[model samples]
Target: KKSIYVAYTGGTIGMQRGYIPVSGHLQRQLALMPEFHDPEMPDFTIHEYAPLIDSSDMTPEDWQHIANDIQQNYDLYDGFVILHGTDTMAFTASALSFMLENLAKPVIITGSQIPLAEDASDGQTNLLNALYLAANHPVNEVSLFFNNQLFRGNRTTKAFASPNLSVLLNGPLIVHRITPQPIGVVTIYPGISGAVVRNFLLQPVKALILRSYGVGNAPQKAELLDELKNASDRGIVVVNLTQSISGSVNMNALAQAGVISGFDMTVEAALTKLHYLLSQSLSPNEIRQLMQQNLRGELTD
Candidate 1:
């Protein structure tokens, strides 16, 4: 029989009915589910995180832990399921896609729109399908299984809900560790002053995510452009991400200002990707170049 490993990293999926924090709560709930224990189902193990993290509080450091866990068990399991909260799931998913090199086994990251403890919960379906796909379908990549659809983890961004939402290499398996790095995202708004942009640069941020307008257009104000150019000259990896949900950054005033185009990468992907790159010993130019290039399918161009 095939074996799968489940990393219960905490989220709405495992919360108790009364909102009480209970250790082994998710495990206890799973034991009562017949489908999970069915003869046709793959044997599995759950590794619950200590002091279960609220998805809102997740960080790059937490991502490293998940990647490390998978690496240690890579040889023992046919597939892996990561039970995470929806809010930051895409970020973790994106980070994992880049960190795990030469990945051959399926890694499905999933979460529920509603808690399993409730009667109207979507956790059961999400969890069951995740495990089923992990064991039987094997996409050989990091994917998010939610709302009845599967998506490339890095390419996924949370979408609206009625009560719903939600790489390849031939070398040996390697898990890249991502150390914490200071990163920031600034949304371009009309009439935003240059001094305001300068104030953001005063901080020790190593990278900046510039949420530009349609197809990477940003205000062409000389002062604002100067500030962005200054930031880039100082070794800050400024990434131009389109505010539109489905389009790639094609180029505009921001591109001429020296910020690297993030193509179609979601903000979650860009932020985590920057953290992943900044944690390494790479120079700013190297980081900027890689940001534009595809690694783990985070970018379209």
Candidate 2:
């Protein structure tokens, strides 16, 4: 009774002999699976991309491609699902959250740790859960579904914020490049030096997500404070985030942390938002304001 669009970007959900695109193969296999044809399952269509990619080879262009595909057919379906690899699933999820603006439909990203073709693959359960939630769930944002739990896409960062690669949109629609940009993450250790911090910040860094102690407290060393304030003065957007697994940051909790503001988003979302904002040609002040303030569904309120 319901319909949804499924994007089969290559992953371990199912495997073929070589790395070639497995578009038709996945569909055929799904058709043969009784669960896919169950009366409760919604009518579905599959769009698999060419040169099926490994999670290790994912790129920003690929992220844009996935988002564009959803944008292309967003209205035709009740929801959408992405058959993704686990490693980059969160990255794509966060990217899509920002890319798909004004989104009011469930966009569920799911992948299996094992291939469904295996006798006991978890892909079957994951894929089915994704489809069921896409068509029936009331949520209207990007999410990463795994292990029977749902997580906000933007906040789910793997490998320390976003991986080393992402996309850049030049001009308008015509200027999309799957190019790689620089986003450096500097975690302050117990005895981190101010000079070392400045050295990292002064380099070819677009944005910096400074990991602070609980409640966004950083050392009050005058030298370190000077370095951070100068970085903020010179138009480098620095975000203070709590290193603790759960809790928000407070810039005013420490006088030394005054140069930066606390952001209540995940490391991955913060990094992705930094990348997305840098792409928009916004000024540092404008970028800083937007970064602290939640845009769309990226932050945790």
Candidate 3:
């Protein structure tokens, strides 16, 4: 029997009575599970990271640590299952997909909306399905196994609103809607126009470069120019990638114009694909020099 490594990175599934500290109690509970024990049910092992709690506290550094751990232990297991919190699972999944390059084994991330101790909890089914997929599915990719569906890591987002639950329950609701619809006469064809069209064009090519700073100084405006100059000097295109979800970058403005030379914005797989394209054609120096260069359909214009 091949051994499977179940990496429990703390989440709500591991939570217990009254939101208690998820250290000793959660560990002991997980240790007692038959799935983690049964010598006959395909060899498996549990590895837990400390200070595990609600996933709200998760950070990119934690993601790096998880990726490093998996990389170090990749050869020892047939597949890897991550028991993660649902709140930030999508982000973590996206980060892992980016960090773990050329992966060819199951990396399933799963968690429950409710705690496992409850009779109606979704945790058990999620865990079981995750293990089943890891063991039986032929897919050699990173995925999120939750709510009875397996989704490509980079393409998934938690659509758990009470109003959205009906749509999500049916399966890949967003993707299905976004796919091209055949036009028909006397039918209310979903016309592509207005915000949706603008969003469709803008969302896929946007990229953000984080800016850092020193000690306090009235949040100086000149500092922005200095940073922009530094980025340009390093061959980095300083585009106005707004943090605001509601506003669009005015590409025609003098302040924003000519700032974005070779760059485009994309989320998840598109972003990764863009990076991969840039990495292939350009040296590290060239990448800096032509940061805005569009390659591999990763950007437009």
Return the top candidate by TM-score. 1
Better structure of 2 and 3 per lDDT = 2
Expressed as tens digits, the lDDT of each residue in 1-301 for candidate 2 is: 8898988887878665443345587788898999887888888898876766577788777888888788788778889999888887887888777777767788888887667776777788888888988887747778777776666777666522322222110122222222345667778878788889888777577678888888787787667778777776677788888787766776542434334554567776777777778877789888878887878566544
lDDT of each: 0.83, 0.73, 0.52
Segments in model 2 whose C-alpha atoms lie over 4 Å from true places: 16-23, 157-180, 252-258
How big is the positional error of residue 7 in model 3, measured in Å on the Cα after superposition?
1.2
> Which lDDT value does model 1 have at 11?
86
| TM-score of every prediction relative to native | 0.93, 0.86, 0.58
Better of 2 and 3 by TM-score: 2
Per residue, candidate 1 scores C-alpha lDDT tens digits across 1-301 of 8899999888878877646557788889899989898877888898888878788987788898889989999999999999998888888888999899889999999888677867898889888888888898888889887777788888877741211112221687888889888887899899899998898777688888999788778888899899989988889889988887577888756767778888888887888889889988999999988899888876767
| Best model number under lDDT | 1
On residues 244-279, what C-alpha lDDT tens digit does candidate 3 reach at each position? 222222232213322442222223333343343343
Query: Order the candidates by lDDT, highest first — what do you get?
Result: 1, 2, 3
Q: Give the TM-score of candidate 1.
A: 0.93
